[PDB]
Amino acid sequence: KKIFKPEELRQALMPTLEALYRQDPESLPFRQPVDPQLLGIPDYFDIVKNPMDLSTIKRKLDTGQYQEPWQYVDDVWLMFNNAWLYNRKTSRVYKFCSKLAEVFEQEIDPVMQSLG
Ligand SMILES: COc1ccc(CCc2nc3cc(-c4c(C)noc4C)ccc3n2C[C@H](C)N2CCOCC2)cc1Cl
């Protein structure tokens, strides 16, 4: 089995996360964990059982919590799927999520080819 080192993953994958952060306005709702109290949405954690956001993914890369690139991809997709599940299709957050998914798809593919 291919063994990936933490810094190899950070060097390869952090730029793809940065590409998401660079999207403005689209990344703005994703830069910190959803706070249902601040946002007045007490149903949030009833619907979203496994929250995820850019800051959490960044911390996981920085602290070596991914063994394999697919685990990073899964967390990015968890973030997207949570947002598409919770938010209405007409909402800013939903449409912003869709743009981030486009950007991520584009950025991640050449990187995955390089890591194989
Ligand atoms: C720039 O875009 C916005 C600005 C304000 C709002 C309303 C408030 C809001 N509505 C938000 C909704 C979410 C959210 C996500 C993500 N998934 O479910 C929910 C609910 C997360 C954060 C949200 N936030 C916080 C926003 C983004 N601020 C963070 C600080 O800097 C920019 C302004 C929504 C948006 Cl999309």
The DSSP result for the chain, as a single string, is -----HHHHHHHHHHHHHHHHT-TTTTGGGSS---HHHHT-TTHHHH-SS---HHHHHHHHHTT--SSHHHHHHHHHHHHHHHHHHS-TTSHHHHHHHHHHHHHHHHHHHHHHHH-
For 27, the domain range is: 1-116
Ligand 1: residues within 6 Å at CB?
25, 28-30, 34, 39, 41, 83, 86-87, 92-93, 96
Burial class (CB in 10 A: 0-12, 13-18, 19+), 73: middle
Ligand 1: nearest atom to the Cα of 83: 17
**CA 28 – ligand 1 centroid, Å:** 7
Nearest to 31 by CA among 56, 65, 9, 50: 56
Contact indicator for 110, 7 with CB cutoff of 8 Å: no
Query: Residues near 68 by Cβ (< 8 Å), separated by ≥ 6?
Result: 4
CA distance 63 to 68: 14
Query: Residues near 32 by Cβ (< 8 Å), separated by ≥ 6?
Result: 53, 54, 55
Name the experimental technique.
X-ray
CA distance 100 to 20: 6
**CA 2 – ligand 1 centroid, Å:** 39
Length of the chain counted residue by residue: 116
Q: How many domains does the chain have?
A: 1
CATH of the domain at 38: 1.20.920.10
Q: Resolution in A for the shown PDB structure?
A: 1.2
